[PDB]
Design a protein around this ligand. Structure first.
Ligand code: NAD
Ligand code: NAD
Ligand code: NA
Ligand code: NA
Ligand code: NA
Ligand code: NA
Lengths: 488, 485, 485, 488
């Protein structure tokens, strides 16, 4: 045993956890109570499905950011009868009071704000380690890390079974992957069939985000996907709400908390004009920034221009802009070369994925550079050539979750009601043959249902078609109301 | 107007309001060209190869300056063209005149009667003893409807000698259509059969018409291939949305000169058109109330800070009403009677049945006063107050102003050209069945790319390494099939 | 047009484009009334007492449907009225006709020449041997200018017999004014003296004209009291701002039908007018660039997310240029020559000198092509590219569309009525010196209060306890003297 | 000595302070450095005036909220040679790291977040207690509390001098005034001529806010104002920037930090549509709330309607609204009677003044009511009649400073450059006779100057008039550019 080894603790009831400070649980509970009222989709799910306990006997592992919002989700799953283990899908996204309340009251949770990468992958392993009764039956994933671990696990287990050999980190120069290989290697010593049992038992994964979904289709394409997946991201009531309106809320929140910078009057660059970029551009524009968009897609670019935004390449604006936000799901958007051209105290952040939209590696190794931490997740990197700095948020990781609290409860209720519906579907069809080792989306009538569940809370009064009218536009009175390919 | 075709010196038929307006037409067309780079680029790319050489194309699409640039794109690519408008009020007479003079047979004028409208439609389809069209450009499906109904009438007539009976419908307009088919049977009982055997396909522009097409495919009655142009991203998400955001306020201001700021405006529907109309109104300083049947669209509206209510909750409060639904019976007489004095009522959706024009016109003791063309004040006897109806409840943007501007119509129309070229180029290959198709994404993206230089929008280019990372080709397509933008 | 006054059956003089347009005028006036509750409330309050009984009022204010409601408010209160427009293109001929027929002497039409403009101004001031006006309503100060220049010419002539010499000015328009005064001297050398002795005061509407007035007060040449109507809060902060936010895009769309969304638009100036124009453009989806000389206004613009640059930095990039400065030489020939093909250039500020029309018209080898009235394309020989000038560089909103809507003009015009009533009611009391005054706040607030019920805005009423707490009367005025809103 | 008595501490250099935690000073310094870059008006003031030390020998007492922004102000005054003592003008507005850095490095500061009213008035007394060398010469005030203390002090001193009698709190039923009278009473025991010496020596006060300014004109009107005052609020580059754009930034910041509530989709009521209300309405509208305005002023009301906002009385909307913001500077806007009609978890806050826009007194004494603190300055008050709650921010005190960090540095640079200019004027004219015991505003050329100092930072390029042009509009090339009564 390492002096510093990571060890699980247990509640008085013997449920495992590792969180920052259990003493935060009362605070967590207070904010969860407030969130419940803001999440009518999740609460209606509890009312409708609670009494029939549809998840009885089901074991669910989840990776969604361990926020107050995720708490209300977790407690919806447990209210429906599920047993649950959880981790966060980001080193900075956990809200420690939410983690503590869940660990105390409802589920095993391995999560805290300000994890190391080593601690992060440990947490992922623990969320997946159900012990001798086995599991999980079901996965809720956000970004595909959990799913990746299982797939790399099964691979490592096959090599092991057939040649007795273990993974070797020296085999990779990717620092995070070195971590992953080491975790799997030590895992082989404790249960060298962990992942194979998992893959024979897992009924499905529901995946929350665009980047995760892209990973899944790749795995389908190359025939490596080990089980059914529901693409929750592409529900309309997710993509067109969470990705768009959620960022419109949480991008400015992240900037304000992290820097207290005035947005009005500034020039802000948004790289990407998909759903996330549209929402970020809107916030910035609405706050009185002059927004310039970068894009690779001419349709998206043309949309930006119609909204009165300038579209240029980063090179055109790098020396002039005050705020830079990456929204692409791509890599190598803002490179060291760019960063060197930025004005003193330019703010640089990523709200897309991972840590590679911004060139943090090149920044680290810039000779003479000096990192000055202003406060947690606000860092000023000082360039010696100029004695000026740039302000990096959340070390290049998701800035909204890292520097503030992510999206608000109401819009996450939309996303998370889809997650519940997705889990209920996978589970209800465990023995059906209906889902293969492919990626599926939820049908439109359920997508509409999610929206309907949220209207009353806002006092929105929907019109009802007459039969005559429904006949005329050839839709049933109760919907669905739009064609399959409708874009909203 | 004498419903007798006239002819250019060269022998080309036409009927328009006033040929002397041609010079003025041409001046505006020349300006429009600069605003329509997608269409002009199409002329430069395809001009030399004359892909429409020998093609006969009938179009039914509002005869505006923008349509003129489209027509003149088809003819530059070698097509022979006949045209009519798809709305009685949407023609711009100077556009009509310039086209009739310089480029194509046109049967269209602003302020047609319904009888005139249908006569123009027939003329536009009448390629004479020779036959035609090979291709159809359609907006709202009337032309397409006429051919399908005709064929059906012909099959019956051939057998039992039975004619269409206008008594079989209570729809005043459809009676006209039935009577038109009956007369046609009495001259050539195989007109529409011959026609349908020769049509390579139709490209349909609008949401309503496209809806009609899929239904025809479903019930197996569609006679020839159709390209759904509406659902090109660069059509639906631009024209229907940004177009109305421009042309809805234009229509309101021209027709009434009413201040929008400070008012309460109701937008029925929150689809692409309703989204654009609500945007315009809110950006102008109106407080916008939206009605919807779709909870997803309703939630979208609320997220944009708009109130969502039933019409019944706001009918006596709103100053301006705009229908955008593509449905019927949105604003009924019983609603209109409750409206405040001089409430403005209009439709930007479809046809003339979103608003209860029939109920209004037949309301006992009602009085109509024309303020000016396409702005009518109706006074009710019970209250002695009035409402203002725009364009007799037909598309108000085209009726009361000039519809969408050239730049956005260049997006829609570039899609129309691509669709036509696809149908014609594949006329003999059997690629297209008697079904409804949409253009592939690479083409949709090409349309957008063609419009960026004009606005000085500079695109980033992916490195091969980045393209691999997100699994797309450097040159695209950039998004998955199901992407909603 | 024959510059010979015509007369109604009753003997009232007029000159308009076409009297047959009166019916149409009246229909629109009837609609405008409903939209102008401030003016209609003024008729109900003051009608019975006929405060203008026996008054002779001359007005020089764009002869629009809105002005018609104002005119008809003065006459309802008992005034006799003569009127001309203050811009050569701003008259709405149906409004002119209806007023000429039913209510007042009017000398105005759309598309006057400068000679006609000044002739109309003289007629509007010509009350005959009897004398008048007692009161003047002025917009931009031309009428006021004419009287002051005339008096000055008369004082010189009386002594030395010297006439104004048009050679003394290089301003083509002012030559006209000088020649008009000279001719007047040759008939009645005391016209303007008699006039000025009889005028109780003037109420001036616009920023530029008000500026002229304070200058006259400063240099001691102002001949009679003046009320600054522009600087009523319910004028400056509504009309100049929200009015243009409506009428700037209306003008652009009518004149050119160009899509605003996606474009780059430059707004010179960021005062009340520039604020409103920039709002409109940005809300329509243009990317707006502002020019300014005032660092406070410039900072305001940047806080609204607008770029602030010099014209020189954007002249070849912008698609649309709008001048709002009230200054001269904003857009010069040298700028215009650098503009992209079909760049749109217009002025919503003052006169015709914000844009270098003179420099443009005299540019060797330049060619003007009229697309249609008030939309001109000028082609330069060096480049063979063109620009589009709206309304020959005169106020584009009134020139190319219909100016501001009725509701906001009801705010401005209610202030005009209050100002006139104040001057007239105090004609004999010596309350007003030969200086420039603004209306008190309680009146400014009354104007706003009169327009709230129409929009369904419900005000809160202070408790006595609350009024005491913030040191205002329950019934107001609610803000300190210097409050900027 | 009370076991709990409040006692000043002293730096190693013997400068007095009382702050939360001196150990926060490094953090304070890091954020002050960032703020300096965002405050070019204050930094240019240092460059222009530093070398001539115009405040040499001057003693300045200030009450502006003890934020990072105020720090940069304080350090501008000290850079110009001033000696400074400071307190915050609000119990919740201090940023403890800003207070610590100033106490350590630059000035005596008595301020911490989460003061009691007793501690607040103590802090005010200490900021004013210069000791035997006397002072202050100059006052910077925000809300007029400091100014009030001096004026009530002089009164109490006259009664004392003439009859030997002391103030008696029992003489007032206002709980805060009881505190004030008690402070003065104990003060008489230590220096019974403190306030009289003060009033013979103070050269002027510069007052920052609308409510404070109103107090001053009253004092002028009734002949009680003891010295010259500059009305900083009514500089254009204050009122039309700070009050408007500042709230547009800091209102949503306060709501988000305090509640993480989604603003989009909600109904928000803004009471008042002056500069603060305009800025708050804009934020809310921009964030996707449907905003309803209340007003007493028909001009302001009409402005709101032109911006597409509904104008109604509170009674019309109280049961339906989700968020209520008071912006009036008036009292008794949201009463217990209203609060009883609000939906569960309605958010209620004040961004105007004091604690009396919201009926906190009536709320306190509502029978059966239960206050549940979610976290500092977010309280849920549970109504027994309904078992529902309302969420009160910052106990009804300024919510932007209380729940977040107030306005951002750039806009406060505009306000605080006016303050510097105001102090320099009062001081430079100490012996002039130019200022009487009245309220003055700064001339337009200085107002323009403040704006000009901030343009370059934003890259705004100003056009220069030709002589010809300046002649034409009759302004000098170098301004001022607008008439005296111009409203902007
Ligand atoms: N005038 C123009 O220039 C123009 C431009 C583009 C499209 N269109 C036409 O506009 C209409 C709408 O097109 P779209 O693309 O927005 O269609 P859409 O299907 O995207 O939007 C229609 C909306 O109407 C709603 N709706 C249906 N019945 C309703 C009812 N009874 N009450 C309230 N809402 C109801 C639907 O739920 C839908 O969200 C179609 O007729 C289309 O052809 C006109
Ligand atoms: N057409 C209309 O309906 C209409 C309506 C109201 C007022 N007006 C007229 O519009 C003009 C502007 O009025 P306003 O009330 O906005 O005046 P204003 O004084 O409030 O605004 C004018 C702005 O122009 C700026 N300016 C001056 N010279 C400049 C230059 N060379 N470059 C850039 N900016 C410069 C000034 O700094 C000022 O901020 C006046 O002529 C007024 O009479 C027209
Ligand atoms: Na959150
Ligand atoms: Na058009
Ligand atoms: Na008008
Ligand atoms: Na701050």
């Amino acid at each position: 045993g390492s002096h510093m080894a990571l060890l699980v603790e247990k509640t008085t009831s013997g449920r495992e956890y590792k969180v920052k400070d259990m003493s935060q649980a009362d605070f967590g509970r207070l904010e969860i109570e407030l969130a419940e009222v803001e999440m009518p989709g999740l609460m209606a799910s509890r009312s409708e499905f609670g009494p029939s306990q549809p998840f009885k006997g089901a074991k669910i592992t989840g990776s969604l950011h361990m926020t107050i919002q995720t708490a209300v989700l977790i407690e919806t799953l447990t209210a429906l009868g599920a047993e649950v283990r959880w981790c966060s899908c980001n080193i900075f996204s956990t809200q420690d009071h939410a983690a503590a309340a869940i660990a105390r009251d409802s589920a095993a949770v391995f999560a805290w704000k300000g994890e190391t990468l080593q601690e992060y992958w440990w947490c992922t392993e623990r969320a997946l380690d159900w012990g001798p009764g086995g599991g999980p039956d079901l996965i809720v994933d956000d970004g595909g890390d959990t799913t990746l671990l299982i797939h790399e696990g099964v691979k490592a287990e096959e090599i092991y079974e057939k040649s007795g050999q273990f993974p070797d980190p020296d085999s990779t120069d990717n620092a995070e992957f070195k971590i992953v290989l080491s975790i799997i290697k030590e895992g082989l010593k404790t249960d060298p069939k962990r992942y194979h049992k998992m893959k024979d038992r897992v009924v499905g994964v529901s995946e929350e985000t665009t980047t995760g979904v892209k990973r899944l289709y790749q795995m389908q394409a190359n025939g490596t996907l080990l089980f059914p997946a529901i693409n929750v991201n592409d529900s309309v009531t997710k993509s067109k709400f969470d990705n768009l309106y959620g960022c419109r809320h949480s991008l400015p929140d992240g900037l304000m908390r992290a820097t207290d910078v005035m947005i009005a009057g500034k020039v802000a660059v948004v790289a990407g004009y998909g759903d996330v970029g549209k929402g970020c551009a809107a916030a910035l524009k609405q706050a009185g920034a002059r927004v310039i968009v970068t894009e690779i897609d001419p349709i998206c670019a043309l949309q930006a221009t119609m909204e009165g935004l300038q579209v240029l390449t980063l090179e055109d604006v790098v020396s002039e802009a005050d705020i830079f936000v990456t929204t692409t799901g791509n890599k190598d958007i803002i490179m060291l070369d760019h960063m060197k051209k930025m004005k003193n105290n330019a703010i640089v952040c990523n709200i897309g994925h991972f840590d590679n939209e911004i060139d943090m590696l090149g920044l680290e190794t810039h000779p003479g550079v000096k990192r000055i931490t202003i406060k947690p997740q606000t860092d000023r990197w000082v360039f010696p050539e100029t004695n000026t700095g740039i302000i990096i948020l959340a070390e290049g990781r998701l800035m909204n979750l890292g520097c503030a609290t992510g999206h608000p409860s109401f819009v996450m209720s939309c996303s998370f009601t889809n997650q519940v519906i997705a889990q209920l579907e996978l589970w209800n069809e465990k023995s059906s043959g209906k889902y293969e080792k492919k990626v599926y989306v939820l049908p439109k009538h359920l997508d509409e249902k999610v929206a309907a569940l949220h209207l009353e809370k806002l006092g929105a009064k929907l019109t009802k078609l007459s039969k005559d009218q429904a006949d005329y536009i050839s839709v049933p009175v109760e919907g669905p109301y739009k064609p399959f390919h409708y874009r909203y």
